[PDB]
Amino acid sequence: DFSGEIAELYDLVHQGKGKDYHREAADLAALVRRHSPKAASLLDVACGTGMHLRHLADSFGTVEGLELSADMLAIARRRNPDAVLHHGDMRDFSLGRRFSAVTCMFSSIGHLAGQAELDAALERFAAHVLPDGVVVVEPWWFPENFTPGYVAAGTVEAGGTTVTRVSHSSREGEATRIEVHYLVAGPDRGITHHEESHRITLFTREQYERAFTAAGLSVEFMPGGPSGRGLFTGLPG
Amino acid sequence: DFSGEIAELYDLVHQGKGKDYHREAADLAALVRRHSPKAASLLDVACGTGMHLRHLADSFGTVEGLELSADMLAIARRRNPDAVLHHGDMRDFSLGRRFSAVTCMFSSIGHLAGQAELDAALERFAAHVLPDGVVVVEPWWFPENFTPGYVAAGTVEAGGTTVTRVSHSSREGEATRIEVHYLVAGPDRGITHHEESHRITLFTREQYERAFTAAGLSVEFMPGGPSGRGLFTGLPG
Numbered sequence: 001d002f003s004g005e006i007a008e009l010y011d012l013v014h015q016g017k018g019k020d021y022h023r024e025a026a027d028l029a030a031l032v033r034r035h036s037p038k039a040a041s042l043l044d045v046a047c048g049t050g051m052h053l054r055h056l057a058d059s060f061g062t063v064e065g066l067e068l069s070a071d072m073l074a075i076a077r078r079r080n081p082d083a084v085l086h087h088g089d090m091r092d093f094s095l096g097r098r099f100s101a102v103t104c105m106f107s108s109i110g111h112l113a114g115q116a117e118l119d120a121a122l123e124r125f126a127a128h129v130l131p132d133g134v135v136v137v138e139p140w141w142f143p144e145n146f147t148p149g150y151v152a153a154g155t156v157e158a159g160g161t162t163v164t165r166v167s168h169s170s171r172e173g174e175a176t177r178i179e180v181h182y183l184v185a186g187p188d189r190g191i192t193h194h195e196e197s198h199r200i201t202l203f204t205r206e207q208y209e210r211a212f213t214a215a216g217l218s219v220e221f222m223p224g225g226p227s228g229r230g231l232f233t234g235l236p237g
Numbered sequence: 238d239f240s241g242e243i244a245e246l247y248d249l250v251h252q253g254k255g256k257d258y259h260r261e262a263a264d265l266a267a268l269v270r271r272h273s274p275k276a277a278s279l280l281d282v283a284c285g286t287g288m289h290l291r292h293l294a295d296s297f298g299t300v301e302g303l304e305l306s307a308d309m310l311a312i313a314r315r316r317n318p319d320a321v322l323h324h325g326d327m328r329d330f331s332l333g334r335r336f337s338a339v340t341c342m343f344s345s346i347g348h349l350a351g352q353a354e355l356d357a358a359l360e361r362f363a364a365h366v367l368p369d370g371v372v373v374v375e376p377w378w379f380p381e382n383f384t385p386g387y388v389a390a391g392t393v394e395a396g397g398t399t400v401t402r403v404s405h406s407s408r409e410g411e412a413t414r415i416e417v418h419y420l421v422a423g424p425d426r427g428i429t430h431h432e433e434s435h436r437i438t439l440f441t442r443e444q445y446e447r448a449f450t451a452a453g454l455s456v457e458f459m460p461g462g463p464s465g466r467g468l469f470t471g472l473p474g
């Protein structure tokens with residue numbers, strides 16, 4: 001989960017890591033318009049703190065979000081006060097309308113547990129996309145590209161708070177176990193320690209392809225992508 | 238205390254902070270020889286991991302140490318295998334010989350609790366110095382120069398281990414409370430968290446001067462010094 005301090009620290013952590021949501025959103029908007037020139041709407045699934053949405057709103061007249069963490073969604077709603085952002089689950093939701101694009105960014109799809117959940121999410125994405133539109137999924141690493149033992153450490157400061165974050169990634173069966181620790185310090189705060197752990201599924205490329213195909217989407221993989229993990233696109237029909 | 242992982246991390250932490258024990262030792266050796274041209278021996282009290290001693294041994298035919306932490310002293314003895322390094326307490330020890338210089342570096346004197354302990358340590362230092370020699374004490378901050386709320390953060394890597402350290406300093410009556418947290422990570426280790434807390438006494442300049450005088454030493458303060466905290470010297474007579 002992504003609650004409490006995890007959620008409150010998320011944007012600062014990713015700013016310090018140099019994640020450029022503005023450039024990623026401009027790239028996404030152009031990718032959508034490449035397939036759907038008249039595209040006017042976008043649904044960002046697992047939208048987190050709504051960073052992509054805030055920039056995509058400059059480009060699309062209607063942007064909406066779906067997010068299962070209330071604490072992440074609270075930050076997203078503050079950031080996007082004029083947008084409709086829904087609380088719910090990517091495996092089984094129904095908004096009653098379709099969008100030019102359905103996006104699921106930054107490997108959020110890896111929080112699904114196996115093939116049945118992956119297939120269910122892709123079917124929901126196809127159920128919410130228009131016929132000339134596009135479904136965009138940024139996968140987690142494939143098993144052959146996963147680096148067990150990886151350690152990342154960084155420190156960022158803002159507003160008088162210093163945040164140090166360290167992550168460690170290992171292989172646990174068919175998933176990555178990521179452990180993340182934080183030290184959060186400030187002149188009055190003192191030092192507090194926080195920890196979190198995620199299990200992120202190592203779906204193969206073929207497993208993603210199967211989920212897209214079973215949802216009625218034609219699937220393409222582009223290597224590299226916003227995070228080194230590539231990007232899948234899918235078109236209905 | 239300075240046991241376990243605190244001791245094992247100490248040198249790497251201070252290397253990453255840029256502490257230059259080689260230059261500090263060359264400066265100390267020249268300071269001693271300025272007062273005692275024929276100086277041939279030095280005792281480093283609260284010698285920690287023996288970094289100063291290792292360099293001072295290149296300059297003085299006899300160097301010895303005194304240290305109360307067995308874990309710090311174990312590292313010092315490995316680093317200085319040909320030197321006699323004593324286990325004991327700066328407030329009350331007796332080596333049965335005197336030295337050209339008695340040094341106490343990097344604010345170790347701030348681990349003493351009040352005037353009686355400070356006076357007792359300075360008397361022991363004077364009891365171990367030769368008549369043309371010098372006692373050198375690097376103080377902690379004086380109250381007027383202490384910065385409450387100070388946060389320091391740094392990360393260093395060596396040998397496959399990543400160490401992040403954060404400290405926070407506050408005023409607690411007549412002492413600084415320093416809280417220190419570490420995250421120590423590696424590909425097999427995973428991530429471990431450690432914490433420590435010290436109370437370091439905020440002696441005034443006059444209190445140091447009184448301790449030197451009561452030990453029979455004439456005292457001089459030089460601002461700046463190896464750590465910004467200045468340096469006291471004292472000469473017998």
Ligand SMILES: Cc1cn([C@H]2C[C@H](O)[C@@H](COP(=O)(O)OP(=O)(O)Oc3ccccc3)O2)c(=O)[nH]c1=O
Pocket residue numbers: 141145146147148150152167169176178198228
């Ligand atoms: C080059 C490289 C990295 N990784 C893995 C190793 C590690 O699992 C991840 C990089 O670690 P971190 O930078 O902390 O990850 P995020 O940016 O996603 O931050 C969060 C991670 C988890 C929860 C929340 C945020 O990619 C690989 O598997 N292969 C690679 O070639």
Ligand SMILES: Cc1cn([C@H]2C[C@H](O)[C@@H](COP(=O)(O)OP(=O)(O)Oc3ccccc3)O2)c(=O)[nH]c1=O
Pocket residue numbers: 378382383384385387389404406413415435465
């Ligand atoms: C400029 C400045 C700093 N400090 C205080 C604030 C803080 O108490 C200290 C600087 O913090 P850190 O760099 O972690 O200290 P060390 O290098 O001694 O490492 C250890 C500290 C304690 C135990 C072990 C190691 O000096 C002041 O009081 N005045 C100042 O002008």
Ligand SMILES: Nc1ncnc2c1ncn2[C@@H]1O[C@H](CSCC[C@H](N)C(=O)O)[C@@H](O)[C@H]1O
Pocket residue numbers: 002045046047048049051052066067068069072088089090091104105106107108111112
């Ligand atoms: N079943 C599910 N349904 C909806 N959101 C989910 C979910 N499982 C995980 N999430 C959300 O997936 C997100 C992963 S972090 C990625 C957030 C965002 N897309 C960004 O690029 O920053 C979290 O916000 C988490 O709460």
Ligand SMILES: Nc1ncnc2c1ncn2[C@@H]1O[C@H](CSCC[C@H](N)C(=O)O)[C@@H](O)[C@H]1O
Pocket residue numbers: 239282283284285286288289303304305306309325326327328341342343344345348349
């Ligand atoms: N009463 C006492 N007697 C001897 N050593 C003491 C002591 N109280 C604290 N110490 C030692 O004081 C040291 C402080 S850290 C400074 C170590 C060393 N002089 C250096 O410059 O790196 C620790 O090694 C601690 O164990």
